[PDB]
Nucleic acid binder design. Sequence first.
RNA 1: GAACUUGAGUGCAGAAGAGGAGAGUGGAAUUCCACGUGUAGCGGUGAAAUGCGUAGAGAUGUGGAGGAACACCAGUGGCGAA
Length: 115
Amino acid sequence: NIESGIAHIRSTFNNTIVTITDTHGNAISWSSAGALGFRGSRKSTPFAAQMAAETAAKGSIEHGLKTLEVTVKGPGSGREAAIRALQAAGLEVTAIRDVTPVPHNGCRPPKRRRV
RNA sequence: GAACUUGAGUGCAGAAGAGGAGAGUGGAAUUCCACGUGUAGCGGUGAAAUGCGUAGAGAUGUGGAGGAACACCAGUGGCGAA
């Protein structure tokens, strides 16, 4: 039973995962578009991000959270939907923080697609 | 052969620079390894599948290993014969 937590939203182009943890990063609960039965294109859509956030939130509310800090990673379109969905579940969102990993010129990226 | 100082160079006084070689050091990120929390998918596509995952993955926290490259600055900006 913990109150304050961080909501890690990993929004990629293919899927949106939402893990909810305590302030010390111990996992309370998590949800992802795939876990909710979305497949392929559907998982990417922002609608699925909403549903993923709601499902993750309702799992956490059992443990008794009230305030969430939000961290967003990846280039997906889910972050806004997932954040608004967390607010709609009742948990107040203190601050959103983009923590997408930025290399300072490190590893060579994979070759560009010729689509 | 003898003069001259503009070319060329030297002296003296300043200026900028990713110019080069050598030796160190630093932060981000990817991967891997160990551990805590935690559960059913993760990944990928135009759509899928191969692949990875209940032998506990992906997500998340701490620490560690190693290799390569140096975000912002950064600019028809600088330096170099290329």
